Amino acid sequence: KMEELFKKHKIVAVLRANSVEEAKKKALAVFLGGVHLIEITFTVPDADTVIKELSFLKEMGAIIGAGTVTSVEQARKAVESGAEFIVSPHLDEEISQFAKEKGVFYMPGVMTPTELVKAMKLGHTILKLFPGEVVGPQFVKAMKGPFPNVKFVPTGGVNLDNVCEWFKAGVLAVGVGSALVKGTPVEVAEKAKAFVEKIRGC
Amino acid sequence: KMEELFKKHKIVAVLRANSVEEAKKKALAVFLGGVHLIEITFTVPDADTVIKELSFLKEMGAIIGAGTVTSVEQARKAVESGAEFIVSPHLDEEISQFAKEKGVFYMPGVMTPTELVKAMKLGHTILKLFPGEVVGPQFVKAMKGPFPNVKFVPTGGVNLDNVCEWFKAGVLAVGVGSALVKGTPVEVAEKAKAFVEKIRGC
Amino acid sequence: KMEELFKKHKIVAVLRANSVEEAKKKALAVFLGGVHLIEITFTVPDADTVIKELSFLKEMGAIIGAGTVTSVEQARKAVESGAEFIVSPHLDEEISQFAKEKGVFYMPGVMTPTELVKAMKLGHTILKLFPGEVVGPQFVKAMKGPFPNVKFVPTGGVNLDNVCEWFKAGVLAVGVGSALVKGTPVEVAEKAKAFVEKIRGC
Amino acid sequence: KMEELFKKHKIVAVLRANSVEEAKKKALAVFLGGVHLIEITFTVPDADTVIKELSFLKEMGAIIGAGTVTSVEQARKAVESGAEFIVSPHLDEEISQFAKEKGVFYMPGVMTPTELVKAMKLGHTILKLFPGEVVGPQFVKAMKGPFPNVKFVPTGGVNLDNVCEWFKAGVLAVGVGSALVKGTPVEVAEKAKAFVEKIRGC
């Protein structure tokens, strides 16, 4: 199901913000603009409260998860507050195990073939590729040779000009932060619309 | 001896293909065009059978190995079928150990200084650099400072325009996949000739 | 204090050389040109002797450390000879632990989010980013999102044209090798002056 | 079956070479370029060994025979080493008889109506016409009148410019030597491709 949602929606908003209020307003902006997968990063102050207060959007079909999860303690709080998926920038064995026992989808981040293989050995085949702007689509295309059955969701620098190249390389979905989320609510809602159209357009 | 063969031939064909028949025809094409080091990747269906059926080319001086080796079970099959060398995209401690006991040359893939150091601690000084198109010659030149005695064989994006830059950076040999191997047998045999000449030419 | 010195001086000369004499002359050149943080790499022959013979420059305010430290045995020699800080290209748990017990500042090198997190778990928040020319400022900016409290000192390709971009990305200091250190003593002393001015200039 | 293979493939490479190694490389070149009928002439040194060492290509669908067979002793060695067909430049009653008892297809060479008739009396209706460059398509057309049921495979001078004229005259297949086989492996593989296309093209 987690796989199937990424496949269908193709875009996850990676939401960094300086306050609970800003984070909630941007999550609403993004949703109102057609982005259903919303990742509340743990760099947001009181990121758990934000996830809990957005729980109602689930009734409107939003899928609210947590990102920048770097300890099992953070993972527990996110899940306790209703996170439907966990994302980290790195591969965390302890978070992998906790999410396995808890029955919650975890997408670890990877930047190398060795990291990729370790993640596969922990049962993962959908991987966050981070930072995407450093490795690029080139990395995604290179992995298709030896690891035809791994799929990536790049985060980092994905924007309006390159989103289609990423999909050409073979990515499953993209995670979009500052290109989507930075600015005012109005600007964010609008940029949300543009990304959906640009993605549909390819 | 394994080192010395890489040093002498300078190019390894990294052979991905959709069938046994295609893989064998491309391995013959490449050999006929002057490429003696042939890596049958385990993304080739029945890659073991292909290695076994190419065993006779060893009598003509071909050196047939296996690539995209990701488990010890695959490693065992490759060696059982006559592989003279094992290559992986990542650093695998279990494959390192098996190849050590079996007395077969293993070239793990590495993308970072930490991975490099771990591989050295496992006894390796000839490393696959993968994906070469992501890190580049720049990475090879950067490693010369702190690790003067490590040598790289980059795989990923090596082509006719950049092969000489790679050798300028200090690589021991190059692994060439799609630029060499994609196309028909005739086109592959011809591209094989071009790479040998271009490499000799630098 | 180690943090505070990096913060104040902003540049560390990464000194590779073919002899004790060349290394000492270049360390003097660099210091005479205004660079106070001097990293004697262990690729310098008898790098310990060089650190010991430069010990007097500490009385003039030079801070002499060791780089390219790849084993605890090398780490011990460097510290025994008066190294005030230890730098490696990779993350080394054994060197981390030794430096912790010995009470000496260690800056491990990292290239990925997973490596970064492991280093943080070992108590490090100032990280060498290596090779900087492969990942770039882009990597430093990407890390600010999920890891706002990590600071980088990139080594690899930092030069007169890009030093200000690096500081724009949010680095704590830069480690400069060949752009600073290559050439004759006179040329090195002069390039030292240029880097200090260019850094002040941004 | 022998008839039917000639009919289907339309071209037999007549392989003369100065060594075992050259002969094998050219047979591979030709096969890789789409020529399935390969005639190893007995002017090749150790022509039997070459036929035996190419025996595996039979598993890839190559049909390996012997040419320039001029005694029953040579015929025996060729058959013993796996030759699937025997070709001679002349009509040899002794080779005809041996091949009849052994159950192996023999194509004797003929240049005159009297030779043709003698071959028919020995049970042959598929004849090598040799030397084709001396008699020409004219000879093939002339034979259609009195001997409508004889079919020729000309050897001698068949090339890219005249191959279609030969087929216009009514030949069953062509045997191509120097126009196909002379040059390096790469050049031979390529010329092989050209002949197949030119033949298909008519």
Residue numbers in the entry:
A (entry chain B), B (entry chain B), C (entry chain B), D (entry chain B): 0 to 201
Paper excerpt:
In the present study, we used the SpyTag/SpyCatcher technology for the assembly of SARS-CoV-2 RBD on a protein nanoparticle platform, SpyCatcher003-mi3. VLP display of protein antigen has been shown to further enhance immunogenicity by facilitating antigen drainage to lymph nodes, enhancing uptake by antigen-presenting cells and increasing B cell receptor crosslinking.
In the current study, we investigated an RBD-based VLP vaccine candidate for COVID-19 based on SpyTag/SpyCatcher technology which was used to assemble RBDs into the mi3 VLP via the formation of an irreversible isopeptide bond. We saw no sign of aggregation following coupling and the RBD-SpyVLP is homogeneous, as shown by a uniform peak of the hydrodynamic radius (RH) at 20.7 ± 4.2 nm in dynamic light scattering (DLS). Cryo-electron microscopic analysis of RBD-SpyVLP cages confirmed the presence of reasonably uniform mi3-cages. In addition, at low contour levels, the resulting icosahedrally averaged reconstruction, to 3.7 Å resolution, showed decoration commensurate with the anticipated appended SpyTag-RBD. The low level of density is expected due to incomplete decoration and likely flexibility of the spacers. All tested mAbs and ACE2-Fc bound strongly to the RBD-SpyVLP, showing that a broad range of epitopes on the RBD-SpyVLP are exposed and correctly folded. Testing resilience of the vaccine candidate, we found that RBD-SpyVLP is stable at ambient temperature, resistant to freeze–thaw, and can be lyophilised and reconstituted with minimal loss in activity or immunogenicity. We showed RBD-SpyVLPs to be strongly immunogenic in mice and pigs, inducing high titre neutralising antibody responses against wild type SARS-CoV-2 virus.
